[PDB]
Amino acid sequence: EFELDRICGYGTARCRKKCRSQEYRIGRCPNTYACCLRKWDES
Amino acid sequence: EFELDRICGYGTARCRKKCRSQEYRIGRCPNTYACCLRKWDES
């Protein structure tokens, strides 16, 4: 089983239900989810 | 751009670089990643 997850933010960010503690929200994905961009600090 | 992510743990868990704070590690995915199972508490 896989999941096809969208990479949002013009290929920089990931669509999530909820952003991780070391990510910033930078918008919404069309499916509803948050678009989440890593801080350098996340890794 | 998408990413095809593996659902591990016999369809219960997700492969991640690092498990989220309200997930438990329940193994490794073949690509190297942690297999991460949600607590009821994650959601």
| Residue to substitute from A1, A12, A22, interface B, most B β-carbons within 10 A | A1
Way it was determined: X-ray
Dihedrals φ, ψ of B29, to 5°? -85, 160
8 A C-beta contact, residue A32 and residue B42: no
Residue from B31, B43, B38, B41 nearest B11 by CA: B38
Dihedrals φ, ψ of B30, to 5°? -65, -25
| DSSP reduced 3-state for A33 | coil
Q: What is the resolution of this structure in A?
A: 1.6
How far apart are the CA of B4 and the nearest CA of chain A, in angstroms? 5
B6·A2 Cβ contact <8 A: yes
Beta carbons within 8 Å of A16's beta carbon, 6+ residues apart: A23, A33, A34, A36
Q: Chain A contacts of B14, Cβ < 8 Å?
A: 3
Q: How many CA atoms lie within 13 A of A1 on its CB side?
A: 9
8 A C-beta contact, residue A13 and residue A37: yes
